[PDB]
Amino acid sequence: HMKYNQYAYVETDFQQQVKELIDINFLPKNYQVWDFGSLLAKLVKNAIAEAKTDAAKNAKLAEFAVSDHQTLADFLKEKPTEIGTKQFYNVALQLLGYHVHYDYDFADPTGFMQRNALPFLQDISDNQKLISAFYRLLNTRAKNGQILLDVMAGKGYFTQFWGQNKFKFFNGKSIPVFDTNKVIREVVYVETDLDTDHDGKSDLIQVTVFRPEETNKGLKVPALYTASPYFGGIIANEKRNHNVDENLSDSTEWNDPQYVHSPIVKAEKPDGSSRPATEEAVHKSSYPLNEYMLARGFASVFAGAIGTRGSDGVRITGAPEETESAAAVIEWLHGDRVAYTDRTRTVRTTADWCNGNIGMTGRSYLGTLQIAIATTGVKGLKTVVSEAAISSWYDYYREHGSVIAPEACQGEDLDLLAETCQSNLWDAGSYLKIKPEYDKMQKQLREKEDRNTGQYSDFWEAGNYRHHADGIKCSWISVHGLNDWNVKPKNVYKIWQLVKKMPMKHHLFLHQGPHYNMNNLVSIDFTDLMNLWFVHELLGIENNAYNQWPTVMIQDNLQADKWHEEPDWSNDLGQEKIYYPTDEGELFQDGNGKAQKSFTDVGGIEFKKAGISESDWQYKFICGDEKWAKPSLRFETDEFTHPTTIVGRPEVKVRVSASLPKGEISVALVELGERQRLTATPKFLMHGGQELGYRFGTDTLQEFVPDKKTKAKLITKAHMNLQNFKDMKKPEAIDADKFYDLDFLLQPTYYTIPSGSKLALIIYSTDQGMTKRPLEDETYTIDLANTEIKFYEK
Template sequence: MPKSTPVRAPLHTRRIPWRALATAAVAALLAAFLAPAAAQAAPPRESRPIYSYAHAVRESVWVDTGLDEDGDGTSDRVAADIVRPAEPAREGRKVPVVMDASPYYSCCGRGNESQVKTYDASGHVVRMPLFYDNYFVPRGYAFVGVDLAGTNRSDGCVDVGGRFDIQSAKAVIDWLNGRARAYTSRTGTRTVKATWTNGRTGMIGKSWDGTIANGVAATGVQGLRTIVPISAISSWYDYYFAQGAPLYDGGPDDLAGYVESDAARAHCAAEQRRLADGSPRSGDWTPLWTERDYVKDAAKVRASVFVAQGMQDLNVRTKHFGQWWDALAKNGVERKLWLSQTGHVDPFDYRRGAWVDTLHRWFDHELLGYDNGIDREPTADIERHPDQWVTSATWPPTGTRATTLHPAPGAVSGVGTLGPRPATGTETFTDDPKLGETDWAAHPTTPTPEKTGFLTAPLTHDLRVSGTSQVTVTATATTASAHLSAVLVDVGPDTIRDYADDAEGITTLENRTCWGASTPGDSACYLETAAKTADVDYTVFSRGWADLGHYASLAKGVPLTPGRSYTMTLTLAATDHVVPRGHRLALIIAGTDRGLIDPPSTKPTVAVELAGTSARLPLVGGAQAFAHATTGTTTTPAPGRLKGVGAPRTTSHIPGD
């Protein structure tokens, strides 16, 4: 992607005959003369907090989107609240922009402390949620908080990731770059231009906010230099469904109603109906989902992408970052990645100091053009144990190979082996919607009727799974509908973040730390957090689900013919997990995963045909690493019920904090 070049101050020196340097006094004078120029010669590597936050300019504009979503006959305007340093404009210098476009600025709040925007009597923003303005404005950036269409002070209707959502933010970037019109009020005629910015914009945000960053980047809009999506959606179909299996008991119309403003609620019934009609609970892919699929447009992305994701996020699951990451890689997009053990948690709340420092350096590099070396550092940071991080030069690591493993019958029906050789035979399970992955993984070596499991022997060497796995299942159901779940389990003791807890792996403490400058109305100080951990005997580290009736196509599910076999490949959530020496790798295949997918209309008994069933895992070192890790013998844990985290909490259909 095009890079901005840092301004390098020229080294100006006066030509002085060497004979004139005969005395020490003259030499000292020359040294004093040269010192400032030499200091200016070094290119800047870090923006410094040299500007006043207390005296920053706070203003609001309403940007014309060019769309009339609410059908009132006038073009919708979206509100953008701005905090920017006053000094650069007075000195004739332009600043870049950090932008967070969100539907949550009034209804629900942002961050661990659920902050909302507040305003003074004149309607100017007083408190901007999160630390971005406090930290970056003194360092020479503007911060822009955009209310998505139909929320807070913006016109229009909420369309949940559709073109109005995306245009809400894209229009602001167009305005920042002189391509759109903005006004000083919601209904007035007085226009305003963004003369204070160079147009270089970096978008950031968690969940829905980060999703908008993905969607805007997929338009290829000029001026958007980088995005930082945190636990963000890349395809809205995959938020509500997993290959035909419904994931939540709501739909995008419910979500729109949750965040829309009172004004939108009064005018947007037609949009609500369109959302409901376009997202049937059948799990069929409709045009509504095509509009909200950003992965298909990855080739248009001009911006660099810095992804942060919790590997145990069961709200916005890691399939979203995995498919987005892979699509961006195919198109040569510059990328960086953080993967934590948490659930749906912002890096500010699990690795605060390192996150702020890395984000600072990333924006300095991408928006100011500073050569600070961040582009030459390892691509990925991965949390291997709570608060213990490793790096990976590339991700997935060089040498990662898709390796096919096959389930085979074991000595006891319902508990088989997992290895490199194909096998024949059949294993059966009966769907029990009252049970889920934690129940299955608690009995990996014991046959139970609701699952079938396959395990390696205890590993003699570590085995690293890095990337997206696929499990192909050939199955016969006794009824006309059946759902499938496939989970990968690390069987062995460990201490992990307690992602199933309500806080999803963190504990909020009572002390505060400060990240930037404060004003009486906008504090830069936030409650600290610590890792909330659990001691476990197993860890479910990847999972995937599907409706077998969608075996042929996501476009249309069909009733199954009892007794007929069908083959379907489940795409599992992307991950980076090391199964340590002495542990066992398990593949479990079952039906309804309680609390994570809705059950089918029937409770089928499913026969899994082993000859047509396999797991394709991205192993670092490939088949050779698997052979190495499964050579020899180690102590086998005694069979019995194992302990994991509590059952995953029932996830809401709100992709926010």
């Protein structure tokens, strides 16, 4: 049993139900003259889209059952005038892909449905109720995660409408009435206003367009644009990641690198003419959601922008030029910027197939650039679905004055990520020209990123999208995994605090995954919600999308099929609590420790000697392995007697002294207890079990499940440079053996500690997987009488 929760079902009255059923050729136009048996047989047989003649459909009826002693065929032969509730759903559950005995009992089909959160109609005693039961059924999530109508679509139900060259809606959502055999996958070259490769010419960027062939027949469609720096190819460079096994250095060496923009060379203007594209796409959609929506009439557009394959320029990680080159594609889609058929710039081509409404899609670098482009208020951008996104690039490689890696990306920085996406180097003819420009940018990025001091700067400030949040004009969806330690959740939290204040409509989805999607889960119909959303925002159809579901949806960390509905994500969801350490290694609301406890950090010496992995170190560390926990102070609460939900950003105050005139402190909150927590990533339940359309590719149904027992889980943590004790934006010299007050915030969370578990505050320094790993020892002393951890709880 798992709850296939459904939030995207729009309440529909019977007249509108009838209208939609007739429109999709499911219900006869004159349904009122049809008797009950004739109706029920036709509606079941129409759902059985794999049988193509009426004879074939009829033979299929023997394979369904209304009870443990009667097939559907034999039921129909009795000339029935109604159908009991259990009888109908003994048929329905099979249409939904459930199996009798193994999933449900003949005796209790609606009991089963109730426990998988599937709706059912209690009363089906006439033609009207039977039609409404079948309308709800078509809108019912099947075992493979998709509503029954999409299973019918996978069986080709909607190919009968192909060639009608128009959108068609069902329960407010676009359905697959487009000839996906004829879908157009072409390539153009948009002209930016940039000259990042210093050749005196506007940088052209290769742009991949997937559009329904129906656009060749006058239908204008919206576009879902994905700004993907990876789209042209990904250069592996992990061996070039900067060494992190180095001692800390004096941050007062900071001299505040400055941001300087690239040369501008303004592009020509569009002149009205257009010739069709002359190149077919070779790169594929990187998110099944886009292909799903493409089968349903929405074009998808993909571009790497400057520095990527078949494009001019260099990557400049996080810079305004990455925003501008990426936004240039929307300007072309809205008909304001020029594009060409090839890189000779001789023949202009337009996005005249586009209805002028653009939304964005994609995660990570792709969701990062949606935040960036949104702040420019570019005309045409109506909505973003920003997934797993960086909202400020300092927050991806730094924190509180210190150099802090993404998980499994030790030593990565702006210069590494620039090369990673510098895929025009793969064109060896362009390599001759681009290689020197790429080298110059490598030197500038390596210098300005300032790994020596870890400090913020005017340079880093250029990559802080949150300081232009006032520019956002589009509606807003953010998606983020609560356990994403790659793009850490601080990014989405801090942009949400700004965006939630703004007049446009906004939602937030937080799932239990790490750097990972949530479009194909058992527990939430995210794809159907986005369908409803994109139809409202990009087709201007009034389908209740602005009233359909809650602002914030937060997947529960104890039950994967529980989704919390909240008005916000902020400390304001809970109430303030403060825990104080004790001299006995405890953590209590009335704690009153007074000792000065010390720990000797041994940098990366012992970690690199032991040869263990970074994730092995982290787990043994938070579990309190003696060998790895020795460089730390641990404070445990007593076992919780009721579950408690920590919400928002915990804030630590800590008075500390260091043996050297420099250093860093890390602070973590850990849940203690041996139990089966959720799997790190969703478990695959039906591999390629979802149809994106008719013969249009698949996705995999999955969901988090109880894992092998673990003894602990990291809730949240953060790091801080000692020399920033006074100012997050300005370092200061410090004396060894003098106490300083650090006050800083941890990563945002939404985490239910279950009863019977303990909460551990850990104070330490070197994080083998995310800080620098010094080659020297350093002793820290913490004044327990001036240390505390404060967080909000619900």
